[PDB]
Design a protein around this ligand. Sequence first.
Ligand SMILES: N=C(N)N[C@H]1Cc2ccccc2[C@@H]1NC(=O)C(=O)Nc1ccc(Cl)c(F)c1
Ligand SMILES: *[C@@H]1O[C@H](CO)[C@@H](O)[C@H](O)[C@H]1NC(C)=O
Ligand SMILES: *[C@@H]1O[C@H](CO)[C@@H](O)[C@H](O)[C@H]1NC(C)=O
Ligand SMILES: *[C@@H]1O[C@H](CO)[C@@H](O)[C@H](O)[C@H]1NC(C)=O
Ligand SMILES: *[C@@H]1O[C@H](CO)[C@@H](O)[C@H](O)[C@H]1NC(C)=O
Ligand SMILES: *[C@@H]1O[C@H](CO)[C@@H](O)[C@H](O)[C@H]1NC(C)=O
Ligand SMILES: *[C@@H]1O[C@H](CO)[C@@H](O)[C@H](O)[C@H]1NC(C)=O
Ligand SMILES: *[C@@H]1O[C@H](CO)[C@@H](O)[C@H](O)[C@H]1NC(C)=O
Ligand SMILES: *[C@@H]1O[C@H](CO)[C@@H](O)[C@H](O)[C@H]1NC(C)=O
Ligand SMILES: *[C@@H]1O[C@H](CO)[C@@H](O)[C@H](O)[C@H]1NC(C)=O
Ligand SMILES: *[C@@H]1O[C@H](CO)[C@@H](O)[C@H](O)[C@H]1NC(C)=O
Ligand SMILES: *[C@@H]1O[C@H](CO)[C@@H](O)[C@H](O)[C@H]1NC(C)=O
Length: 339
Amino acid sequence: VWKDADTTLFCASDAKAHETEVHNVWATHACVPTDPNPQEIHLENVTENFNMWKNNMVEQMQEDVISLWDQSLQPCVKLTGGSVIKQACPKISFDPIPIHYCTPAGYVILKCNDKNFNGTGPCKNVSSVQCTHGIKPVVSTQLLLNGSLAEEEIIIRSENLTNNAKTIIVHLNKSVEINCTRPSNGDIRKAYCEINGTKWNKVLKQVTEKLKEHFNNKTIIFQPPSGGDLEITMHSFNCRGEFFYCNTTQLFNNTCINGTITLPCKIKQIINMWQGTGQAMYAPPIDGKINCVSNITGILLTRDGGANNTSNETFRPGGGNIKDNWRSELYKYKVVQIE
Ligand SMILES: N=C(N)N[C@H]1Cc2ccccc2[C@@H]1NC(=O)C(=O)Nc1ccc(Cl)c(F)c1
Ligand SMILES: *[C@@H]1O[C@H](CO)[C@@H](O)[C@H](O)[C@H]1NC(C)=O
Ligand SMILES: *[C@@H]1O[C@H](CO)[C@@H](O)[C@H](O)[C@H]1NC(C)=O
Ligand SMILES: *[C@@H]1O[C@H](CO)[C@@H](O)[C@H](O)[C@H]1NC(C)=O
Ligand SMILES: *[C@@H]1O[C@H](CO)[C@@H](O)[C@H](O)[C@H]1NC(C)=O
Ligand SMILES: *[C@@H]1O[C@H](CO)[C@@H](O)[C@H](O)[C@H]1NC(C)=O
Ligand SMILES: *[C@@H]1O[C@H](CO)[C@@H](O)[C@H](O)[C@H]1NC(C)=O
Ligand SMILES: *[C@@H]1O[C@H](CO)[C@@H](O)[C@H](O)[C@H]1NC(C)=O
Ligand SMILES: *[C@@H]1O[C@H](CO)[C@@H](O)[C@H](O)[C@H]1NC(C)=O
Ligand SMILES: *[C@@H]1O[C@H](CO)[C@@H](O)[C@H](O)[C@H]1NC(C)=O
Ligand SMILES: *[C@@H]1O[C@H](CO)[C@@H](O)[C@H](O)[C@H]1NC(C)=O
Ligand SMILES: *[C@@H]1O[C@H](CO)[C@@H](O)[C@H](O)[C@H]1NC(C)=O
């Protein structure tokens, strides 16, 4: 028997000690080796409640990634709280690796295996494990990249769907590749992402159909972000250490609800830090072909308020609270203390 509890987790990974890549280096010093023979016990006739929106595992993962980025990605200039901090900003090797979150003695992680579990409420198929799956700490806005897919139907997750101020996590059940490149040989900050339009519009149509199930069959309309920092109004992510900002206007096209969709992107040196601490300025992009091919596995949306009088609901890509990114991966886990 057990009870819900918070405690300090540890991390495990297959990081390489000879690698200079920054996630590898961090994990080599902050994590332990993985278990080659992990035990997972199905709990017969046990129903457990989960709440992904109140899960201290998320805060702990956030603390880790902040620590990793603070040690590994210091900028040439940092503008924070009115002060100016200057330091060396060498180019790095950057490519996220899976990190497992694990409980210490006397604790265990319960895992919800209900395929269509929305993240809050009872779960009928529960197992216990010592560690989560390997979660890559991919920082992005608008689109969730390289995450885990929903096993059955597309899932809409929100702390409170009725409250337009709460971000919606759309959990996709089928990956759509996004292929971003800053071509080798001109404007060195100019880039672009390519997406199969036939595949993407198929998925967006399905997302629309799911949203209709939640919003009483009202007409579902997508619109560009209405304002805010560039990190939010654009799909931002890090590719090989460089900060990409991509215009997603073409991705959320109501008309298509079949060719190649090419989003215009730019590598930015000056950034609003997701840690919420201010601005960071980095050096110009490395030479050559900068390329990242990722799976879109989720979408972060915000719904327009005040459309209750209408027959429409309007959605705009969003994000910016990176805790939501971790939430999208940790939603099926909770820590309990064994009594
Ligand atoms: N901007 C704030 N004042 N505060 C932060 C913190 C915060 C908290 C809740 C909601 C929004 C925000 C803002 N978001 C961002 O700035 C941000 O996501 N940046 C960013 C940078 C780089 C990469 Cl690769 C990236 F994906 C993202
Ligand atoms: C319970 O979840 C486990 C792990 O996904 C799965 O193997 C098993 O088939 C599930 N049981 C049912 C009845 O769905
Ligand atoms: C998730 O499921 C719970 C319990 O079944 C329900 O109260 C809640 O409205 C659901 N939320 C969403 C976003 O479907
Ligand atoms: C991309 O998603 C596919 C499934 O569509 C998966 O086979 C592959 O491992 C994923 N690559 C990642 C997560 O880097
Ligand atoms: C993805 O989920 C949708 C419902 O949201 C469903 O119609 C579709 O069959 C699913 N696709 C796969 C590959 O299971
Ligand atoms: C969800 O949001 C709606 C709209 O703001 C609000 O009326 C309701 O109280 C919220 N529910 C909870 C449980 O906070
Ligand atoms: C990614 O896009 C580039 C074009 O910029 C192309 O040369 C490359 O083959 C693409 N990669 C994949 C895996 O589609
Ligand atoms: C709701 O929308 C669906 C499309 O998924 C449609 O088949 C159905 O007729 C609609 N239901 C009502 C009651 O309007
Ligand atoms: C995205 O591209 C569209 C179409 O060119 C443009 O109107 C819009 O201003 C762009 N968004 C931003 C924030 O640059
Ligand atoms: C929406 O897609 C259609 C495809 O024919 C295109 O003509 C239109 O310009 C698109 N609108 C955008 C990208 O905002
Ligand atoms: C998109 O995928 C389809 C198969 O579903 C394929 O026929 C087509 O060539 C692809 N188009 C692009 C633009 O990648
Ligand atoms: C997603 O994973 C692929 C394959 O490991 C990697 O090449 C790509 O850069 C990743 N995307 C991001 C944004 O980390």
